[PDB]
Design a protein around this ligand. Sequence first.
Ligand SMILES: NC(=O)c1ccc[n+]([C@@H]2O[C@H](COP(=O)([O-])OP(=O)(O)OC[C@H]3O[C@@H](n4cnc5c(N)ncnc54)[C@H](O)[C@@H]3O)[C@@H](O)[C@H]2O)c1
Ligand SMILES: NC(=O)c1ccc[n+]([C@@H]2O[C@H](COP(=O)([O-])OP(=O)(O)OC[C@H]3O[C@@H](n4cnc5c(N)ncnc54)[C@H](O)[C@@H]3O)[C@@H](O)[C@H]2O)c1
Ligand SMILES: NC(=O)c1ccc[n+]([C@@H]2O[C@H](COP(=O)([O-])OP(=O)(O)OC[C@H]3O[C@@H](n4cnc5c(N)ncnc54)[C@H](O)[C@@H]3O)[C@@H](O)[C@H]2O)c1
Ligand SMILES: NC(=O)c1ccc[n+]([C@@H]2O[C@H](COP(=O)([O-])OP(=O)(O)OC[C@H]3O[C@@H](n4cnc5c(N)ncnc54)[C@H](O)[C@@H]3O)[C@@H](O)[C@H]2O)c1
Lengths: 258, 259, 258, 258
Amino acid sequence: TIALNNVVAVVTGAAGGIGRELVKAMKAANAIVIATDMAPSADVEGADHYLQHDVTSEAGWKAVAALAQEKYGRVDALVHNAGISIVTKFEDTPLSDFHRVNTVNVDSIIIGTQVLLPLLKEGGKARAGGASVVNFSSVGGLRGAAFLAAYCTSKAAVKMLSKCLGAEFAALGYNIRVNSVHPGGIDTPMLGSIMDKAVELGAAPSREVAQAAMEMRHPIGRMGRPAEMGGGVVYLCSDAASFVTCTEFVMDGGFSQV
Amino acid sequence: MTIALNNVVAVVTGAAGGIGRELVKAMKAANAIVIATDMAPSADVEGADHYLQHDVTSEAGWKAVAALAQEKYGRVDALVHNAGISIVTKFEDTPLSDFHRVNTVNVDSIIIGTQVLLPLLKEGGKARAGGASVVNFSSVGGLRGAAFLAAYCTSKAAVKMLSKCLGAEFAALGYNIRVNSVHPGGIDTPMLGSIMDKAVELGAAPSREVAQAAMEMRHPIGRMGRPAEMGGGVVYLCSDAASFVTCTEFVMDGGFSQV
Amino acid sequence: TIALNNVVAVVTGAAGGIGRELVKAMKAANAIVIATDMAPSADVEGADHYLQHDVTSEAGWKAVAALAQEKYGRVDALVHNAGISIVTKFEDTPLSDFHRVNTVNVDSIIIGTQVLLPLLKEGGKARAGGASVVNFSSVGGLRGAAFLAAYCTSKAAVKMLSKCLGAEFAALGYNIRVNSVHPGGIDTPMLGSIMDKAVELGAAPSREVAQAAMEMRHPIGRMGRPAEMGGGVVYLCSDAASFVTCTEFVMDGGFSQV
Amino acid sequence: TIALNNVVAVVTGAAGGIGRELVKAMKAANAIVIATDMAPSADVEGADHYLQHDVTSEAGWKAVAALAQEKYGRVDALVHNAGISIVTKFEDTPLSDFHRVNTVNVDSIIIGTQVLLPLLKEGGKARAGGASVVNFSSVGGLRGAAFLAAYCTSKAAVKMLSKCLGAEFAALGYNIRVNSVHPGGIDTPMLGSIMDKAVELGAAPSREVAQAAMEMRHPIGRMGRPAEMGGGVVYLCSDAASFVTCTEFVMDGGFSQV
Ligand SMILES: NC(=O)c1ccc[n+]([C@@H]2O[C@H](COP(=O)([O-])OP(=O)(O)OC[C@H]3O[C@@H](n4cnc5c(N)ncnc54)[C@H](O)[C@@H]3O)[C@@H](O)[C@H]2O)c1
Ligand SMILES: NC(=O)c1ccc[n+]([C@@H]2O[C@H](COP(=O)([O-])OP(=O)(O)OC[C@H]3O[C@@H](n4cnc5c(N)ncnc54)[C@H](O)[C@@H]3O)[C@@H](O)[C@H]2O)c1
Ligand SMILES: NC(=O)c1ccc[n+]([C@@H]2O[C@H](COP(=O)([O-])OP(=O)(O)OC[C@H]3O[C@@H](n4cnc5c(N)ncnc54)[C@H](O)[C@@H]3O)[C@@H](O)[C@H]2O)c1
Ligand SMILES: NC(=O)c1ccc[n+]([C@@H]2O[C@H](COP(=O)([O-])OP(=O)(O)OC[C@H]3O[C@@H](n4cnc5c(N)ncnc54)[C@H](O)[C@@H]3O)[C@@H](O)[C@H]2O)c1
């Protein structure tokens, strides 16, 4: 079947809405999971290890590399799930707000992948299918939206970085697959904040009209649940996805395709 | 839970072909009940619970598939439209009837088959919260054009767009049927073999080795796919794990379309 | 800058909403225009010739080729603008309805381009920039929609045929550019009928709710006017577009990109 | 007709290969052109004004706004053409190289558009078709490539920022169109440097094999000339493009579509 036997997996933002479900799903497929987030401690069901980890910190990433190096000697799967959103009027958004979003959503992938690259190369030797790097983009990386300039721009950067790394790692013979994941509206605190800030900005009349409008834009007719992200990430991390690199893996209830 | 097809009644067309045989094996391995169909009057398809002779261009052929599924199971949970053909031709020497022949196998198959199995797919939609799953075999050729592949590419773009429309329509009508398109890159099957040889005979390529190396180098991963590398993706789309996936382009192309 | 001096242009569906504006725009850029449509006669402003022409008829296309051959000896620009739409429930749509839409929207381009290919090759020798074939696809060729299965499928076929012919004509050295045009909601009888059938199908509560919904899906916030298609087609037909082939040329008020 | 009569246009990187052709083409369509680049002085054919302008400098942009405000009272067209490229091995690329490319290619558009927004709103009142913002992305913003991680990521950011601003400015009623332009391989010093650095990196055996490979990846079979970018930018800046916003305008010889 589709499984993660003998897969050492790093999952960032692992205490968040999607992150907790990714850890559960990956443990259920038999992965060894190093879960990381900003809290000094967390109870992440399915994590074999929890590390305090700011994805903007090279030192934080070196601590992840040290634990993986010491305990396992490789990383087979790297899930860059940590990210933030802001909802703002472009003309009232200082350059520093774009930079803050870029640092969390994009620099995290650049720093993390550079620091774990020796360990990912070892995973490329451990499985014929390759090591697997899974970057959380968004439907916002595919389709623009009013008031989401900073967020959408960062998620398009994540998408394109995924294509470039997939092509480069294959050309250099590292046997490391890199793919971008594009969730639609998923029922988490992040989507909650975006909807509330849309109301305060006066993009939506009320939080109920906003919710109904966003749900109706999805052909499937509802928000996604965080658990509905799990199987896709397990697939991309598995040897079943050995021919999948540089790809836009969409889990959006049809949002981007209508 | 995990990614599995427990109590999934699956119809797979072109099931005796290079990819089709691996789809049946993969889906059986995930515990699906598989009705395999192809043009031969009989075939030994590893993992098939039933084999039916089935021309996907024939409404009567599809009604025989519906009758067996109706009688034995009362539903269809997964429908994999994998039957397809390719031609390689000079546009100016391609009669309208060659476009129509490719359209009939690659597109009309999905229209006729989905219409005939729709009552059974609606029952699939009631049997699983995630929905019935219709998986349409498009191509990277449905995403990116190519010289001398006008008839094939046009049909595979039609398959892709039909998938989006049916996903949106079945959701709007409340049927709980997911529809997605699959886009393989160059997969090592008799079909890829014939396309390369016919490219040589047409005088597109010097030799079969230069053709193969050129096609391999277009894939960032640096090689053609193996048929077995299609199996997991189709199992995922057919499973409840893909409950939030409809209208989607599911690409298995070694990076071909993205550089 | 952007002109069609010494350009012999064939425009199909030339009596329709967009077609009439294409002929006006192309005449205004100094093209010689052969206008064609289903009516036995028409007064098409800017046309140097009108021909009765069923785009599904090889004999109809041969009559267009004969007039162009006899009077000018070439075709520099071929605009495949003829098309139909239907709005239907998939499960109630006979295969013959898909085939009827395919015959007008796709077979027209196959038959017409094959019949005019000798004349387009002469266009290819007359201008460094090349002969130009402009195929009318749709945003419906880029994004799906409930109840538009037959229409959307045909317009995606038009889009992909455009890419294949652009690549093939370049590989064979014919100097013929081929591009697809993707209009959004344009205010013509065709959009009117689609909206009116959407109501009778019970897809929309009223035509006013349908119209407002469709207008709001366009970021620009309104339907296009037929005249807003003219400049884009003039550009693609001109030497200014000498580096444009196989391209999706979108005129959709941002519809496809959100 | 496609013209820029009474259009006040700002063009950045105006002394470059493409920039000089954009200024010539826009003057030929009767635009008033404020040309800007890094040099303290330059002889830019077709420019009514030249300003020294670092597109990373808020103060530099305020000087452009002051001249336009004083002399014309509006900006009708803003062409963000300034940009840089690097070719690097991801694992040897410091975070500061990504940031440098982002600052020139993306922050330029954020700072410039914020500073000129009052003047663009006046452009929006001067023409029913709207003010026009044209952002130079790349085929690199659509398709990834090995060794172009920093460049491709920045050009995908430019593409998505274009979609977001098009949607946002329309939602706020400012009547400002925003589009991204995606050139293929254009014969300029920038393409020259990329090809040479590809050889030094050992991505290509020789500069002749690199050149032939890049030319053959374009269906049209050659590099573009800078002049082949001019018509497209004139079209997007004109009232002929009144229904074009949020759009990917591709001038790539078919590169992205095969
Ligand atoms: N929920 C949606 O609708 C949606 C849609 C598109 C994509 N996404 C993406 O999915 C991913 C998961 O989002 P979510 O919905 O679970 O949101 P969430 O906010 O619940 O989870 C994000 C997690 O990232 C962590 N994080 C933030 N900054 C960090 C930093 N500097 N260092 C370390 N950890 C940091 C947060 O602590 C949080 O636990 C994100 O990449 C998000 O952008 C979400
Ligand atoms: N191999 C590749 O490189 C490649 C690339 C992209 C897409 N695909 C698609 O994958 C699918 C499977 O292809 P494959 O490579 O295994 O090809 P294949 O030729 O090995 O198998 C296709 C099967 O369809 C059957 N078939 C043909 N016409 C039929 C009809 N009228 N009724 C019933 N069955 C019919 C054939 O007999 C065959 O068993 C096709 O849709 C193909 O277009 C393959
Ligand atoms: N209006 C829109 O919203 C919209 C949307 C996207 C695409 N388009 C496309 O733009 C093009 C122009 O359409 P329009 O909106 O002006 O519609 P229209 O119906 O006003 O014009 C289309 C013309 O095609 C002609 N035609 C139909 N069948 C023909 C045949 N067999 N032979 C010859 N001529 C035939 C009709 O006589 C008519 O004059 C079409 O291809 C259409 O699908 C329009
Ligand atoms: N030439 C190609 O093949 C190609 C490919 C795709 C995209 N592009 C894009 O086209 C645009 C123009 O490219 P080109 O080939 O003319 O490049 P070029 O190097 O010839 O011109 C770019 C100009 O930008 C200017 N510039 C650089 N940094 C600046 C700064 N901080 N402030 C102000 N001006 C600055 C340079 O001085 C130069 O004159 C760029 O945005 C480039 O990314 C070009």
